[PDB]
Design a protein around this ligand. Structure first.
Ligand code: HEM
Ligand code: HEM
Ligand code: HEM
Ligand code: HEM
Lengths: 143, 140, 140, 143
């Protein structure tokens, strides 16, 4: 998976992440950039404008749960398949989420991290995060 | 297909790039090569080390092309015909690679222009880059 | 982006559908529903059993829409604007599903018109369906 | 993950398959429909028109090998992940074939079977083959 220096770089930025906003911004951006994903979140109410999406408290709260799931990934990098087994089951059997969307969300999270960290989100730090988000996407798609 | 709002967002945002176009092009390429190393196989003749002038030079060319695309956003198949021939007919670039570079361009723009990279602008830049990518991977 | 040759290929091949419009449309839908069960989630209000009246009726509408697309192949965004609003705005169909339906359409054509379905025509049909798909998943 | 009825339908059709032709047809169509795939096969020489491709003897020979591997899978549906274990290492490490292309070839093969069998290639028969080709593509992507 990650080289030790990749791990420390990844871990160092992750510890600084705005836990209240970053997950919400990634989920929000997914809904805005890829609007078909809004189909899965009808229970969230108004998603009819970008402002409405980004400010929606269900988007923010669910986004925080998504971020916690990514964090759990980072806590379990040599066993992503087992970590995400239950979540993979959920997204496939119950939710019917096409797996290409897992890759889209992972990449939107990368954009948000770049957005928040600016020049600190260096090409090598991006490279390491790309490995993480692809691993999480693969793990979610496994079932 | 781009909305009228999409065209105006892209014009406005890519306008903010200006003098840094070359610089942003080079960084996006560098991001692509490091994050998705299989893309390097299209550039066996390049110096691909960090700071490489070859990458810098090519980044300017990619950026300049996008600027021209923005200028002819209603006319892209015509305006980009030479590049389509190059990428689709000659180089046979797998379309996956365009998604990778487009992503890396968005990351670069987010890292550099945080005030301008709103959700709306992000969505329009994505659709624009997808459209350019379709043209460059099309044989017409 | 479709070539001139793509446009003529599609015209000649799709023109052979004729009276078989509803028939081939319904078959493509049935192939999609059986091969790719998650696509049934867009039609919870339909009877989806073999030979269903609803699937027949719907297949005709899909096939006639493609006939209309062929007739307006150079002006597809304008001609398919209401259908784009339906699929992109109201139904929010995941673009993956267009790929599945387009594949099932190709399968249906190959099974029925083996003389027409040459490799060159297969290629032009695939580009045509991808372009119709882009129109229906965009809002512009 | 095939049911007995699906396995019987797949097996019966595959018995009738022209083993020297169908693989070349599927590979030839891959190269014509998705011309970037030509990048991986430059040793084949002229692939510059649909006709040059479809009549290329290297296309025909390699497609026979491709078809033979699908036949392998078909005789071992419950263990595709080991049946394709070696092939998986080749396409990822040495050949750098993006995984989306495996799914494209599987679907092109489905198209070829429909072309060859017409009305016999019924919707349930296709459904069974879609599971087969997804299985093969998954198994090949495993590394
Ligand atoms: C790829 C990274 C993803 C991660 C890490 C992730 C994680 C999660 C988590 C932790 C939950 C909460 C499960 C629970 O309440 O027990 C969840 C639920 C859900 N996810 Fe995801 N998810 C991802 C991608 C997606 C995508 C791409 C979609 C659709 C576009 C999606 C749609 C949903 C839905 C609809 C729910 C249920 C929400 C509700 O109504 O309560 N997820 N996900
Ligand atoms: C929107 C995306 C892209 C744009 C705007 C773009 C633009 C260009 C331009 C302007 C050139 C130089 C052509 C000339 O001299 O007139 C070029 C060359 C090239 N592009 Fe791209 N390109 C894009 C994506 C890609 C991707 C994704 C790859 C492969 C990973 C690729 C590989 C190449 C290669 C190999 C060359 C030849 C370089 C050389 O020999 O100097 N391009 N591209
Ligand atoms: C070639 C691509 C497609 C074409 C040409 C097409 C065409 C159409 C047409 C003509 C209608 C009827 C609109 C009306 O009667 O006013 C329609 C409705 C619909 N389409 Fe599509 N469609 C396509 C792809 C899809 C896909 C991939 C899905 C989802 C799997 C989908 C789901 C629907 C649904 C749910 C309706 C509403 C049906 C009803 O309530 O009667 N379509 N489509
Ligand atoms: C998904 C189904 C596929 C199967 C079952 C398959 C099977 C095989 C087999 C058995 C070989 C070894 C042939 C031999 O030399 O004896 C092989 C080689 C090869 N495959 Fe595939 N393959 C598949 C997809 C692809 C795709 C999508 C590509 C790229 C477009 C690709 C590119 C190659 C290449 C370049 C070789 C080396 C052939 C040579 O130069 O001798 N394959 N494949």
């Amino acid at each position: 998976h990650l080289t030790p220096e990749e791990k420390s770089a990844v871990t160092a930025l992750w510890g600084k992440v705005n836990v209240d906003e970053v997950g919400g911004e990634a989920l929000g951006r997914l809904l805005v950039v890829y609007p078909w994903t809004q189909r899965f979140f009808e229970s969230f109410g108004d998603l009819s404008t970008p402002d409405a999406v980004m400010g929606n408290p269900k988007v923010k709260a669910h986004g925080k749960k998504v971020l916690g799931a990514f964090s759990d990934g980072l806590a379990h990098l040599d066993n992503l398949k087992g970590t995400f087994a239950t979540l993979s089951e959920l997204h496939c059997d119950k939710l019917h989420v096409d797996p290409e969307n897992f890759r889209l969300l992972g990449n939107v999270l990368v954009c948000v991290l770049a957005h928040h960290f600016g020049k600190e989100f260096t090409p090598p730090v991006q490279a390491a995060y790309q490995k993480v988000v692809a691993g999480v996407a693969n793990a979610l798609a496994h079932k | 297909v781009l909305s009228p709002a999409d065209k105006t967002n892209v014009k406005a945002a890519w306008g903010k790039v200006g003098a840094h176009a070359g610089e942003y092009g080079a960084e996006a390429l560098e991001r692509m090569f490091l994050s998705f190393p299989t893309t390097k196989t299209y550039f066996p003749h390049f110096d691909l080390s960090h700071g490489s002038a070859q990458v810098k030079g090519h980044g300017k060319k990619v950026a300049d092309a996008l600027t021209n695309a923005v200028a002819h956003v209603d006319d892209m198949p015509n305006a980009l015909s030479a590049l389509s021939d190059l990428h689709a007919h000659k180089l046979r670039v797998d379309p996956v690679n365009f998604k990778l570079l487009s992503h890396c361009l968005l990351v670069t723009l987010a890292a550099h222009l945080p005030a301008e990279f709103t959700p709306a602008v992000h969505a329009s830049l994505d659709k624009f880059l997808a459209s350019v990518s379709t043209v460059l991977t099309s044989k017409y």
